[PDB]
Design an enzyme around this catalytic site. Structure first.
Site, PDB file in Angstrom:
ATOM      1  N   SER A 113      23.212-116.625   3.018  1.00  0.00           N
ATOM      2  CA  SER A 113      24.246-115.616   3.195  1.00  0.00           C
ATOM      3  C   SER A 113      25.435-115.990   4.067  1.00  0.00           C
ATOM      4  O   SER A 113      26.423-115.261   4.089  1.00  0.00           O
ATOM      5  CB  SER A 113      23.671-114.304   3.685  1.00  0.00           C
ATOM      6  OG  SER A 113      22.863-113.731   2.665  1.00  0.00           O
ATOM      7  N   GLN A 129      19.691-107.202  -4.116  1.00  0.00           N
ATOM      8  CA  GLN A 129      19.590-108.244  -5.109  1.00  0.00           C
ATOM      9  C   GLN A 129      20.025-107.797  -6.485  1.00  0.00           C
ATOM     10  O   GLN A 129      19.719-106.676  -6.915  1.00  0.00           O
ATOM     11  CB  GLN A 129      18.128-108.709  -5.200  1.00  0.00           C
ATOM     12  CG  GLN A 129      17.558-109.195  -3.834  1.00  0.00           C
ATOM     13  CD  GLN A 129      16.188-108.586  -3.439  1.00  0.00           C
ATOM     14  OE1 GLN A 129      15.972-107.373  -3.533  1.00  0.00           O
ATOM     15  NE2 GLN A 129      15.276-109.436  -2.975  1.00  0.00           N
ATOM     16  N   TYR A 150      23.618-103.630   3.136  1.00  0.00           N
ATOM     17  CA  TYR A 150      23.901-105.023   2.898  1.00  0.00           C
ATOM     18  C   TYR A 150      23.422-105.400   1.496  1.00  0.00           C
ATOM     19  O   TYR A 150      22.289-105.109   1.121  1.00  0.00           O
ATOM     20  CB  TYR A 150      23.177-105.845   3.946  1.00  0.00           C
ATOM     21  CG  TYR A 150      23.448-107.310   3.935  1.00  0.00           C
ATOM     22  CD1 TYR A 150      22.601-108.170   3.271  1.00  0.00           C
ATOM     23  CD2 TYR A 150      24.523-107.849   4.621  1.00  0.00           C
ATOM     24  CE1 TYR A 150      22.797-109.530   3.313  1.00  0.00           C
ATOM     25  CE2 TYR A 150      24.745-109.216   4.663  1.00  0.00           C
ATOM     26  CZ  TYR A 150      23.878-110.046   4.000  1.00  0.00           C
ATOM     27  OH  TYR A 150      24.063-111.406   4.057  1.00  0.00           O
ATOM     28  N   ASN A 164      23.883-108.347  -1.890  1.00  0.00           N
ATOM     29  CA  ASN A 164      24.460-109.459  -2.643  1.00  0.00           C
ATOM     30  C   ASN A 164      25.156-108.955  -3.885  1.00  0.00           C
ATOM     31  O   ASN A 164      26.136-109.553  -4.332  1.00  0.00           O
ATOM     32  CB  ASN A 164      23.374-110.427  -3.068  1.00  0.00           C
ATOM     33  CG  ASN A 164      22.771-111.145  -1.905  1.00  0.00           C
ATOM     34  OD1 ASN A 164      23.458-111.449  -0.957  1.00  0.00           O
ATOM     35  ND2 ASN A 164      21.494-111.453  -1.991  1.00  0.00           N
ATOM     36  N   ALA A 193      20.141-116.927   4.944  1.00  0.00           N
ATOM     37  CA  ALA A 193      18.842-117.427   4.577  1.00  0.00           C
ATOM     38  C   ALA A 193      18.781-117.666   3.091  1.00  0.00           C
ATOM     39  O   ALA A 193      19.396-116.941   2.300  1.00  0.00           O
ATOM     40  CB  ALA A 193      17.748-116.420   4.947  1.00  0.00           C
ATOM     41  N   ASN A 248      13.390-120.850   6.845  1.00  0.00           N
ATOM     42  CA  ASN A 248      13.900-119.500   7.093  1.00  0.00           C
ATOM     43  C   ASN A 248      13.089-118.817   8.202  1.00  0.00           C
ATOM     44  O   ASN A 248      12.126-118.115   7.934  1.00  0.00           O
ATOM     45  CB  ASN A 248      13.825-118.680   5.801  1.00  0.00           C
ATOM     46  CG  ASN A 248      14.296-117.251   5.982  1.00  0.00           C
ATOM     47  OD1 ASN A 248      14.933-116.909   6.975  1.00  0.00           O
ATOM     48  ND2 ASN A 248      13.998-116.413   5.005  1.00  0.00           N
TER      49      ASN A 248
HETATM   50  C1  LIG Z   1      19.146-111.561   3.814  1.00  0.00           C
HETATM   51  C2  LIG Z   1      19.489-112.183   2.485  1.00  0.00           C
HETATM   52  O1  LIG Z   1      20.664-112.010   1.832  1.00  0.00           O
HETATM   53  N1  LIG Z   1      20.635-112.718   0.655  1.00  0.00           N
HETATM   54  C3  LIG Z   1      19.449-113.336   0.568  1.00  0.00           C
HETATM   55  C4  LIG Z   1      19.083-114.124  -0.513  1.00  0.00           C
HETATM   56  C5  LIG Z   1      19.447-115.463  -0.591  1.00  0.00           C
HETATM   57  C6  LIG Z   1      19.063-116.197  -1.702  1.00  0.00           C
HETATM   58  C7  LIG Z   1      18.325-115.604  -2.720  1.00  0.00           C
HETATM   59  C8  LIG Z   1      17.967-114.264  -2.633  1.00  0.00           C
HETATM   60  C9  LIG Z   1      18.347-113.522  -1.525  1.00  0.00           C
HETATM   61 CL1  LIG Z   1      17.911-111.849  -1.384  1.00  0.00          CL
HETATM   62  C10 LIG Z   1      18.691-113.022   1.699  1.00  0.00           C
HETATM   63  C11 LIG Z   1      17.285-113.528   1.973  1.00  0.00           C
HETATM   64  O2  LIG Z   1      16.549-112.953   2.770  1.00  0.00           O
HETATM   65  N2  LIG Z   1      16.811-114.690   1.284  1.00  0.00           N
HETATM   66  C12 LIG Z   1      15.485-115.232   1.476  1.00  0.00           C
HETATM   67  C13 LIG Z   1      14.825-115.616   0.190  1.00  0.00           C
HETATM   68  O3  LIG Z   1      15.532-115.694  -0.859  1.00  0.00           O
HETATM   69  O4  LIG Z   1      13.589-115.851   0.161  1.00  0.00           O
END
Ligand SMILES: Cc1onc(-c2ccccc2Cl)c1C(=O)NCC(=O)O
EC number: 3.5.2.6
Length: 358
Positions: A61, A117, A147, A149, A315, A340
């Site tokens: 992000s 998502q 928040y 995406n 992350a 992460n």
């Molecule tokens: C907080 C956050 O904001 N976006 C993501 C994200 C990044 C890549 C893929 C999917 C998401 Cl939701 C995320 C997060 O926590 N990602 C961790 C993960 O994908 O395992």
């Protein structure tokens, strides 16, 4: 490095790496405008490849800061306005809930409950139109922040439409190239794969998977050197020769909404400096899978405040990143890791380092 920086960084990061079992990490500190780099551990455990200043990490992000600035640049160019209805740029979005949802709302997660998502099932373009047409807001636009995406991702896709460039082409030519971020990528080229770290999730080596609006929301990969340059550019936008880019950086740090002690920019988030560390440390915790918060409009938005803690966490499944800087102090930090690990540990470490140097 000056011994003070060396000591502060090592005394903070070494225990962090141990406590969080981070395989590999890179840190840059920007102190009085100049970068100092530190690396630990492994980019690839199985192949015994160390983290170096050339290692690419998934920013997750933190990518939203690039999207916000690219959008800011498109505003500065006169290609879009944040006050424009979303439907101006996507006429096929005819469903009535879109009435009153502006590009500002998309960019700042205030459209009324767009989800975190985009569903994995959304693969084709027709799937994406269906998804947005069928989405039912929980709230009126401009009343709650969630928040998402799916929100800023759509903003990024629409922001580049008038240019006729793909999102990646626009990012490369309008942001990466002018700022000399020559090892920053939406898609890692084969030539650079030797530098692309693996992420580690439950001990397994992983890279981010393709998804709809990935480039726009979470898809940038970069090195610690390019990220230090990104922080330098955002600390001192006036040094940037390209006029609309200088302006775009400033627009991304404007304060559009307030929730609690936090202000929402375009990608960037901000607090007044000096900050209560407990407020940024605790506030960075994801809590939390979904955190819906009422927002107050800042009418009109406050232009970029130099006395700010400006930051963003990021992350992916296998990576954790953090960037923070304080324009008034010409001070900043980037922390890139291939695990992460919890946000509060990131923010606590960053605050310890920057507070000691301020
Ligand atoms: C907080 C956050 O904001 N976006 C993501 C994200 C990044 C890549 C893929 C999917 C998401 Cl939701 C995320 C997060 O926590 N990602 C961790 C993960 O994908 O395992």
């Amino acid at each position: 490095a000056p011994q003070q920086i060396n000591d502060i960084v090592h005394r903070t990061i070494t225990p962090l790496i141990e406590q969080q079992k981070i395989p590999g990490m890179a840190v840059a500190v920007i102190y009085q405008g100049k970068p100092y780099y530190f690396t630990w551990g492994y980019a690839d455990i199985a192949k015994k490849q160390p983290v170096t200043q050339q290692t690419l990490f998934e920013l997750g992000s933190v990518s939203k800061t690039f999207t916000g600035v690219l959008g800011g640049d498109a505003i500065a160019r006169g290609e879009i306005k944040l006050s424009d209805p979303t439907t101006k740029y996507w006429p096929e979005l005819t469903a009535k809930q879109w009435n009153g949802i502006t590009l500002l709302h998309l960019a700042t997660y205030t459209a009324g409950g767009l989800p975190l998502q985009v569903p994995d099932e959304v693969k084709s373009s027709s799937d994406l139109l269906r998804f947005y047409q069928n989405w039912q807001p929980a709230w009126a636009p401009g009343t709650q922040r969630l928040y998402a995406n799916s929100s800023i991702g759509l903003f990024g896709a629409l922001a580049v439409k008038p240019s006729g460039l793909s999102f990646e082409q626009a990012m490369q030519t309008r942001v990466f190239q002018p700022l000399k971020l020559n090892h920053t990528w939406i898609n890692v080229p084969p030539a650079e794969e030797k530098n692309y770290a693996w992420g580690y999730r439950e001990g397994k080596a992983v890279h981010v998977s393709p998804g709809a609006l990935d480039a726009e929301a979470y898809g940038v990969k970069s090195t610690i050197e390019d990220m230090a340059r990104w922080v330098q550019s955002n600390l001192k936008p006036l040094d940037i020769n390209e006029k609309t880019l200088q302006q775009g950086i400033q627009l991304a740090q404007s304060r559009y909404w307030q929730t609690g002690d936090m202000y929402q920019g375009l990608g960037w988030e901000m607090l007044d400096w000096p900050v209560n560390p407990d407020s940024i440390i605790n506030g960075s915790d994801n809590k939390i899978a979904l955190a819906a918060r009422p927002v107050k409009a800042i009418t009109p938005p406050t232009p970029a405040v130099r006395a700010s803690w400006v930051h963003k966490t990021g992350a992916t499944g296998g990576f954790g990143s953090y960037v923070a800087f304080i324009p008034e102090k010409e001070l900043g930090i980037v922390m890139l890791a291939n695990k992460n690990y919890p946000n509060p540990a990131r923010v606590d470490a960053a605050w310890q380092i920057l507070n000691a140097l301020q």
